[PDB]
């Protein structure tokens, strides 16, 4: 999949339908992979730079590949 | 407001850095051993800018003396360079309103962050090499620069001078490592290790946690880990006052927490305690 | 869902019925989404700012949406 | 359910019958609730002040309500 | 049970033969209780000091009682 | 299984099929074990040194044995 956004996690939102939203760069994307949940909060808490990889590269797009640098 | 950085010998280099640290920071008697103290940037009496004049690249004759770096004080942001030849102070885009006495001013297309310098420069800090040769080169590049654009040559030249001035100023670890290629006759070269980089990314968080220090066995912040007081002083020489965006973490979100003789920054502790 | 309260987590409570409670501001709200318990205690520990979203905005109301900032 | 003990966690102990024991204050209580284990160890490591609520407020007694501050 | 070994976790082996083995003090002990393994990993990662109690106090021996300080 | 590589984790990556990738040394390797994801991520957040054991010791190779040091 191609690189969509790279940057620190600005904020995360735990949605009602049990998905998880994240705000990196200017796009606000979400994932439905339960696993990525604690991994991203850790990322946001420590200030890690993350690359989210996705074709749906627009606010509201879904993703599942993240690089934790 | 005018300091010198002599690159003539590892001795003149190290002595230079020490003059500037005593001038802008005061010792925390809390973290001390061997007549070396951790210093804290005296941020109580306003922020100001100071010039750092690069001298000694060519120790033989001393031509390359027209480089001057403008440095912010409370966070040690390197706001840009000044070509003493035509006196134009080229400042980074994120400091569009900064000015220095005696100079006219030209704003560069890119900002100061490492993310940008590394893009434009085309290289990464980890594995980056530095010696008198690369420094002589980096001087000529900045000197022969005119214009608005942040060119690959300028970014590479700044990655290097920012490392040997500001980063070295903050970390004895980076000065110790680099120092020796100034006295080495064969022209080896210092290589910025991943540990050296990990250090630079944790200045804010360390500055925040370290004054909370009162003799714990160890201090852990991020990927950085210190086994004792000596491991600390051998690595960090200058920290921020967290009692021009401040480099300190956003008030009250990074507190040092001590458990079983080990001092942790709370963001790190919090992130690794989540078991699913 | 609308924003109910925003702030730091004053304190968390593990309940006898396996539900988790939080105090953000003037409200005491609870959630019975298991995987939210780790996230909230870490938000608590690291002093993050959370925004609890729920229509049941009053002491004792339930919730399943949070924004970590 | 009445308050019982309040303080930092002196030590925790994983027992043979898979229950988790907590030593807070003078009382040394325990719990059969699997999820309180992770939460309690974090409380112990971060130095949070906790309040255990139980009727069995005597050494060796079980609990299931906890406040994390 | 008698205390067998006390100290920081020198290293943990997360196997394929699925047995988890920890090195504490001078012995290498193993445990098969699923939740006890995440707890010991947090203890290793954060520097906690543990005491493993067991009758099988010899390299290769198993255990299920741990104290966290 | 034989030692394959030893060092700090440079980065990790959650892949599309829920397999997690770590780069340790000059090799990228992946695992299908879920329980290991947050542990490797934490090994990365704290700079911990690990050894990865596996017969597939080449880039892209798989593994399920790790030693945290």
Swiss-Prot record, chains A, C, D, E, F:
Induction: Maximal induction occurs at 37 degrees Celsius and in low-iron environments. Changing residue 34 to G/F: 100-fold reduction in cytotoxicity. It comes from the Bacteria. Disulfide bonds join 4-57. Changing residue 16 to N: No effect on cytotoxicity. Changing residue 38 to P: No effect on cytotoxicity. One of its GO terms (biological process) is symbiont-mediated hemolysis of host erythrocyte. Changing residue 60 to D: Great decrease in cytotoxicity. Keywords: Disulfide bond, Signal, Toxin, Virulence. One of its GO terms (molecular function) is toxin activity. The keyword Ligase does not apply. GO terms for cellular component: extracellular region. There are three Gb3-binding sites in each subunit B monomer, allowing for a tighter binding to the target cell. Binding sites 1 and 2 have higher binding affinities than site 3. Shiga toxin contains a single subunit A and five copies of subunit B. Belongs to the StxB family. The B subunit is responsible for the binding of the holotoxin to specific receptors on the target cell surface, such as globotriaosylceramide (Gb3) in human intestinal microvilli. This is Shiga toxin subunit B. The gene is stxB. The chain holds residues 21 to 89 of 89 of the full protein.
């Amino acid at each position: 999949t191609p690189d969509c956004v790279t940057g620190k996690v600005e904020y995360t939102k735990y949605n009602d339908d049990d998905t998880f939203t994240v705000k990196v760069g200017d796009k606000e994307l979400f994932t439905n992979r339960w696993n990525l949940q604690s991994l991203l909060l850790s990322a946001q808490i420590t200030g890690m730079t993350v690359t989210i990889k996705t074709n749906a590269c627009h606010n509201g797009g879904g993703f599942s590949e993240v690089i934790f640098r | 407001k005018e300091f010198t950085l002599d690159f003539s010998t590892a001795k003149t280099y190290v002595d230079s850095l020490n003059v500037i640290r005593s001038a802008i920071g005061t010792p925390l008697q809390t973290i001390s051993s061997g007549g070396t103290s951790l210093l804290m940037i005296d941020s109580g009496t306003g922020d100001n800018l100071f010039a750092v004049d690069v001298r000694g690249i060519d120790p033989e004759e001393g031509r390359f003396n027209n480089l001057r770096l403008i440095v912010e004080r409370n966070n040690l942001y390197v706001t840009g360079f000044v070509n003493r030849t035509n006196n134009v102070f080229y400042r980074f885009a994120d400091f569009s309103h900064v000015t220095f006495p005696g100079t006219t001013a030209v704003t560069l297309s890119g900002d100061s962050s490492y993310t940008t310098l590394q893009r434009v420069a085309g290289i990464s800090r980890t594995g980056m090499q530095i010696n008198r040769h690369s420094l002589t080169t980096s001087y000529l590049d900045l000197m022969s620069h005119s214009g608005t654009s942040l060119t690959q040559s300028v970014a590479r030249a700044m990655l290097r001078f920012v490392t040997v001035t500001a980063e070295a100023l903050r970390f004895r670890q980076i000065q110790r490592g680099f120092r020796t290629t100034l006295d080495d006759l064969s022209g080896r070269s210092y290589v910025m290790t991943a540990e050296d980089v990990d250090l630079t990314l944790n200045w804010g968080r360390l500055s925040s946690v370290l004054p909370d220090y009162h003799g714990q066995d160890s201090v852990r912040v991020g990927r950085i880990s210190f086994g004792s007081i000596n491991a600390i002083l051998g690595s960090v020489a200058l920290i921020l006052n967290c009692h021009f965006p401040s480099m300190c973490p956003a008030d009250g979100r990074v507190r040092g927490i001590t458990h079983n003789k080990i001092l942790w920054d709370s963001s790190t502790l919090g992130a690794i305690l989540m078991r699913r």
